[PDB]
Design an enzyme around this catalytic site. Structure first.
Site, PDB file in Angstrom:
ATOM      1  N   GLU A 155       1.211   1.676  -1.889  1.00  0.00           N
ATOM      2  CA  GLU A 155       2.256   0.670  -2.079  1.00  0.00           C
ATOM      3  C   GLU A 155       1.908  -0.629  -1.344  1.00  0.00           C
ATOM      4  OE1 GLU A 155       6.053   2.383  -0.946  1.00  0.00           O
ATOM      5  OE2 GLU A 155       6.182   3.300  -2.937  1.00  0.00           O
ATOM      6  N   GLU A 253       4.438   8.197  -7.527  1.00  0.00           N
ATOM      7  CA  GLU A 253       5.560   8.738  -6.787  1.00  0.00           C
ATOM      8  C   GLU A 253       6.850   8.640  -7.554  1.00  0.00           C
ATOM      9  OE1 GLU A 253       6.417   7.325  -2.874  1.00  0.00           O
ATOM     10  OE2 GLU A 253       4.301   7.441  -2.258  1.00  0.00           O
TER      11      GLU A 253
HETATM   12  O1  LIG Z   1      18.420   8.869   7.701  1.00  0.00           O
HETATM   13  C1  LIG Z   1      19.503   7.977   7.401  1.00  0.00           C
HETATM   14  C2  LIG Z   1      18.965   6.549   7.279  1.00  0.00           C
HETATM   15  O2  LIG Z   1      17.562   6.596   6.858  1.00  0.00           O
HETATM   16  C3  LIG Z   1      16.952   5.272   6.728  1.00  0.00           C
HETATM   17  O3  LIG Z   1      15.601   5.467   6.329  1.00  0.00           O
HETATM   18  C4  LIG Z   1      14.665   5.454   7.459  1.00  0.00           C
HETATM   19  C5  LIG Z   1      13.643   4.333   7.247  1.00  0.00           C
HETATM   20  O4  LIG Z   1      14.346   3.083   7.144  1.00  0.00           O
HETATM   21  C6  LIG Z   1      12.878   4.596   5.950  1.00  0.00           C
HETATM   22  O5  LIG Z   1      11.907   3.570   5.742  1.00  0.00           O
HETATM   23  C7  LIG Z   1      12.152   5.927   6.108  1.00  0.00           C
HETATM   24  O6  LIG Z   1      11.441   6.224   4.922  1.00  0.00           O
HETATM   25  C8  LIG Z   1      10.178   6.906   5.180  1.00  0.00           C
HETATM   26  C9  LIG Z   1       9.017   5.941   4.950  1.00  0.00           C
HETATM   27  O7  LIG Z   1       9.184   4.797   5.809  1.00  0.00           O
HETATM   28  C10 LIG Z   1       9.010   5.494   3.485  1.00  0.00           C
HETATM   29  O8  LIG Z   1       7.915   4.590   3.263  1.00  0.00           O
HETATM   30  C11 LIG Z   1       8.829   6.746   2.609  1.00  0.00           C
HETATM   31  O9  LIG Z   1       8.824   6.385   1.271  1.00  0.00           O
HETATM   32  O10 LIG Z   1       9.933   7.673   2.853  1.00  0.00           O
HETATM   33  C12 LIG Z   1      10.029   8.127   4.249  1.00  0.00           C
HETATM   34  C13 LIG Z   1      11.189   9.111   4.389  1.00  0.00           C
HETATM   35  O11 LIG Z   1      11.243   9.929   3.221  1.00  0.00           O
HETATM   36  O12 LIG Z   1      13.110   7.009   6.340  1.00  0.00           O
HETATM   37  C14 LIG Z   1      13.920   6.815   7.557  1.00  0.00           C
HETATM   38  C15 LIG Z   1      14.860   8.010   7.746  1.00  0.00           C
HETATM   39  O13 LIG Z   1      15.466   8.334   6.498  1.00  0.00           O
HETATM   40  C16 LIG Z   1      17.705   4.446   5.673  1.00  0.00           C
HETATM   41  O14 LIG Z   1      17.109   3.141   5.564  1.00  0.00           O
HETATM   42  C17 LIG Z   1      19.147   4.300   6.162  1.00  0.00           C
HETATM   43  O15 LIG Z   1      19.897   3.529   5.202  1.00  0.00           O
HETATM   44  C18 LIG Z   1      19.766   5.715   6.273  1.00  0.00           C
HETATM   45  O16 LIG Z   1      19.683   6.380   5.002  1.00  0.00           O
END
Ligand SMILES: OC[C@H]1O[C@@H](O[C@@H]2[C@H](O)[C@@H](O)[C@H](O[C@@H]3[C@H](O)[C@@H](O)[C@H](O)O[C@@H]3CO)O[C@@H]2CO)[C@H](O)[C@@H](O)[C@H]1O
Ligand SMILES: [Ca+2]
Length: 386
Positions: A155, A253
């Site tokens: 990405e 994805e």
């Molecule tokens: O857990 C509740 C909150 O989670 C936030 O999400 C967090 C990060 O902001 C988000 O970027 C991250 O995602 C991970 C990774 O960075 C991303 O590139 C990939 O695609 O997925 C990963 C996780 O599956 O996750 C964390 C924790 O969830 C939300 O932004 C917030 O609104 C709320 O949902």
């Protein structure tokens, strides 16, 4: 009781893959998977029997702090990539090596250079990147892993390995590609971008890649229906890149929510207020979504080579009520999306959000490792359900 309408014009060699990068951390956490019959069995074998034919694995250069404390998110490094590959190849499934060229999550907002390249001049970093790719592939080959494709970046909408200038990015893309080409001519080289709803983005990116002579075969795209617009649009922007540049295209994805329930106690990514949810949040809904993306990619025609479901098994290490006992596991085995130890590398995001699985409700297995009927979508798209 699962229904699946036959996908129209689906090529039979269509890539049906899954990215189960978190499988190692999860298994070390004591999570186990089963099959239709209900007996403990290697997830990779269940996937195979489900019709899956490809496995994607993310790879971070050094997803650990100075002391060797994993950053979480599966702590996916070359070593785990090899463990996953070996098992994938052992179950007759090709491998897609996804190089993030970063020590942790690489996405539209994060494309941090690996710590080891932190302060290297561009020229040295470029050769470092090529060297890394080269050695990493060589290691996989030695292990007898059947590599079918390589992703040079993840990405990379606005950056790669600490670089944001597209001229430099292209050179890095080429450095990575070069290593693949020298490793095996049959390995497909893929570049991965996201946010296909953005007007003109993909068209602009493919042109830029063109203008800078980037040598790649697949223009990969992420596709999460809750943010990435319509399936009509996905097909449209991908068909444009395919036709205009003669590239193969695919979805690297995708996923969907089979339940609104958060299974481990760590807020899930979806569903949320405002997100687009054209399919009901149920097992049939999730199956509809997967089947639709496959349809959409297949509609690209000859250039639509496949779809990878992202993390169909990032299930909970434990129930939502054991939140605290769960954190212990996420922290020790990095079986969550991130650990507190990643605060150093990624202070703003992982720093204040670390925890468990944010997508347990998007898996194709229940919170107990048992496959959901929706796992049958990979087979049924070819024929349909009786
Ligand atoms: O857990 C509740 C909150 O989670 C936030 O999400 C967090 C990060 O902001 C988000 O970027 C991250 O995602 C991970 C990774 O960075 C991303 O590139 C990939 O695609 O997925 C990963 C996780 O599956 O996750 C964390 C924790 O969830 C939300 O932004 C917030 O609104 C709320 O949902
Ligand atoms: Ca969760």
């Amino acid at each position: 009781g699962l229904y699946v309408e036959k996908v129209s014009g689906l090529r039979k060699d269509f890539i049906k893959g899954v990215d189960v990068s978190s499988i190692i951390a999860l298994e070390e956490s004591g999570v186990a998977f089963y099959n239709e019959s209900g007996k403990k069995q290697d997830i990779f074998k269940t996937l195979k029997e489900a019709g899956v034919n490809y496995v994607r694995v993310r790879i971070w250069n050094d997803p650990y702090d100075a002391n060797g404390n994993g950053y979480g998110g599966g702590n996916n490094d070359l070593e785990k990539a090899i463990q996953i590959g070996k098992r994938a190849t052992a179950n007759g499934m090709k491998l897609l090596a996804d190089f993030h060229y970063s020590d942790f999550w690489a996405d539209p907002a994060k494309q941090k250079a690996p710590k080891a390249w932190a302060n290297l001049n561009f020229e040295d970093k470029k050769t470092a990147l090529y060297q890394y790719t080269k050695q990493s592939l060589k290691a996989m080959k030695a292990a007898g892993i059947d590599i079918g494709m390589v992703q040079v970046g993840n990405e990379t909408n606005g950056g790669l390995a600490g670089e944001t200038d597209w001229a430099k990015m292209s050179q890095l893309f080429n450095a990575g590609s070069q290593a693949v080409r020298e490793t095996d001519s049959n390995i497909l080289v893929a570049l991965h971008f996201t946010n296909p709803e953005t007007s003109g983005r993909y068209a602009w990116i493919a042109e830029t890649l063109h203008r800078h002579h980037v040598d790649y075969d697949v223009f990969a795209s992420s596709y999460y229906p809750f943010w990435h617009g319509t399936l009509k649009n996905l097909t449209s922007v991908l068909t444009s890149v395919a036709d205009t540049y003669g590239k193969k295209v695919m979805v690297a994805e995708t996923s969907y929510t089979y339940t609104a329930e958060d299974g481990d106690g760590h807020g899930n990514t979806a569903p949320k207020n405002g997100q687009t949810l054209n399919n009901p949040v149920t097992v049939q809904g999730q199956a509809n979504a997967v089947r639709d993306v496959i349809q959409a990619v297949s509609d690209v025609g000859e250039a639509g080579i496949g779809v990878f479901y992202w993390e169909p098994a990032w299930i909970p290490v434990g129930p939502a009520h054991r939140l605290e006992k769960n954190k212990a596991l996420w922290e020790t085995y990095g079986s969550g999306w991130a650990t507190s130890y990643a605060a150093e590398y990624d202070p703003e995001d992982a720093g204040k959000w670390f925890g468990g699985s944010a997508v347990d409700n998007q898996a194709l297995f229940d919170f107990k490792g048992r496959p959901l009927p929706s796992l049958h979508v990979f087979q049924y798209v070819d024929t349909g359900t009786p």
